[PDB]
């Protein structure tokens, strides 16, 4: 699996620890108090791939963007 994100220094484990997925939503606003704690803002993209045979395979990618 893999995970590819820019601000992975921290956004990698957050968007990937939840479940290396994002499916729920491969998009996030830079107004999040979470990304602010890391300093990610803006238009950053995050990739998260998981494979599991067991589960399946899944590939997702988040993308923090300001909003507006």
Curated annotation (Swiss-Prot):
In which domain of life is the source organism classified? Archaea
Q: Where in the cell is it found?
A: Cytoplasm
This enzyme's EC code(s): 2.7.7.6
- What class does this enzyme belong to in the EC scheme? transferase
Q: Name one Pfam family in it.
A: RNA_pol_Rpb5_C
Q: What is its main location?
A: cytoplasm
Cellular component (GO) terms are: cytoplasm; DNA-directed RNA polymerase complex
Keyword terms: Cytoplasm, DNA-directed RNA polymerase, Nucleotidyltransferase, Transcription, Transferase
Q: Name one GO biological process term.
A: DNA-templated transcription
Which reaction does this enzyme catalyse, per its entry? RNA(n) + a ribonucleoside 5'-triphosphate = RNA(n+1) + diphosphate
Q: Name one GO molecular function term.
A: DNA-directed RNA polymerase activity
The chain's disulfide connectivity reads: none
Q: Which InterPro entries match?
A: Arch_Rpo5/euc_Rpb5, RNA_pol_subH/Rpb5_C, RNA_pol_subH/Rpb5_CS, RPB5-like_sf
Give the PANTHER family listed for this entry: DNA-DIRECTED RNA POLYMERASES I, II, AND III SUBUNIT RPABC1
Q: How does it assemble?
A: Part of the RNA polymerase complex.
| Similarity comment: family membership | Belongs to the archaeal Rpo5/eukaryotic RPB5 RNA polymerase subunit family.
Q: What does this protein do?
A: DNA-dependent RNA polymerase (RNAP) catalyzes the transcription of DNA into RNA using the four ribonucleoside triphosphates as substrates.
What is this protein's record name? DNA-directed RNA polymerase subunit Rpo5
Q: Which organism is it from?
A: Methanocaldococcus jannaschii (strain ATCC 43067 / DSM 2661 / JAL-1 / JCM 10045 / NBRC 100440)
